[PDB]
Amino acid sequence: SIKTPEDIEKMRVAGRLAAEVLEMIEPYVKPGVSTGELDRICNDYIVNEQHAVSACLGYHGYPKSVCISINEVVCHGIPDDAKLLKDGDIVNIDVTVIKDGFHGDTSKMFIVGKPTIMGERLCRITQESLYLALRMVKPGINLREIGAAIQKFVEAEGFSVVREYCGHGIGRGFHEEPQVLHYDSRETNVVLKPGMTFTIEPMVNAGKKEIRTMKDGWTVKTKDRSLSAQYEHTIVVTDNGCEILTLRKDDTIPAIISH
């Protein structure tokens, strides 16, 4: 669907709120803190300060407000008061808020304590894969091209792209069409049009692409237990490119990408 100027404004608000949850939580992401407390901090902020709601809680039965995944956990890590962050960890906090009917969806990696060169490299490359994709977004381009570019860049780094999950259209619905694969697929045939709003959120494994879902029916880890990183932004396709609706102060890419 093509969002209207009004809907896009609402997406800007929702996207900014999502991004600000990530900016707000940054100081709390330090050695010793539990992912459970991080989640509570994020939820209180979303509800009490942003006057918004987490779109995650309850979705497909998800128990928490945000997803927090550490190191080998690929995605959907469930915040737990007993899971503490430690020196060297790489942690993804994935946020999605609903404000005035629209969704803002974004995530980023945080390196805890003294960074490891491997962790820093995986996160940097993963973000760069998102960035290169964002720089390709504009009317007329096929999502297949973008997915192909992400995969090519990631694999060239000796990393892999997780296939079970993809980006997605977003708006009044958390996950709307189209599906945004982060790898080349013969099934992908979607030509971008102005006003389209979707996410790009590649999950990159340091090791093999295969994953394993834990027995809590949520937590996903790399099959080989290698590190996995993910970054995500919600965007709106413009006439000559795109606008990142979930940009943060620490992002090293412009909010408005012109061509």
Ligand X SMILES: O=C(O)c1ccc(-c2ccccc2C(F)(F)F)o1
> Of 13, 176, 42, nearest to 102 (Cα)?
13
Q: Which residues are annotated as a binding site for a divalent metal cation?
A: 94, 105, 168, 201, 232
Judged by beta carbon, residue 76 or residue 221, the one nearer ligand X is 76
Residue 70 contacts residue 225 (beta carbons within 8 Å): no
Residues 167-186 that bind ligand X (CB under 6 A): 168
Among 7, 72, 201, 251, indicate the residue that binds ligand X (CB under 6 A): 201
Among 199, 205, 222, 228, indicate the residue that binds Mn ion (CB under 5 A): 199
Q: Which residues are annotated as a binding site for substrate?
A: 76, 96, 175
Q: Is 39 in the site for Mn ion (CB under 5 A)?
A: no
Burial of 145 (0-12, 13-18, 19+ CB in 10 A): middle
Q: Is 108 in the site for ligand X (CB under 6 A)?
A: no
Select the binding partner of residue 228 from ligand X, Na ion, Mn ion, none (C-beta < 5 to 8 A, by kind). Na ion
> Of 137, 128, 132, 150, nearest to 242 (Cα)?
137
Order the strands of the 73-75 sheet from edge to edge: 73-75, 220-222, 211-213
Among 50, 106, 228, 246, indicate the residue that binds Na ion (CB under 5 A): 228
Residues 104-133 that bind Mn ion (CB under 5 A): 105, 107
- C-beta of 253: minimal distance to ligand X in Å? 19
How far is it, in rounded angstroms, from Cα 31 to Cα 37? 13
3-class DSSP state for residue 242? strand
How far is it, in rounded angstroms, from Cα 57 to Cα 11? 20
Number of residues that bind ligand X (CB under 6 A): 11
3-class DSSP state for residue 184? coil
Residues 77-96 that bind Mn ion (CB under 5 A): 94
By beta carbon distance, the residue nearest ligand X is 62
Distances (CA, A) of 158 to 30, 71, 209: 29, 17, 11
- Contacting residues toward Mn ion, per CB under 5 A: 94, 105, 107, 199, 201, 232
- Contacting residues toward Na ion, per CB under 5 A: 69, 73, 228
- Contacting residues toward ligand X, per CB under 6 A: 56, 59-60, 62, 67, 76, 94, 105, 168, 201, 232
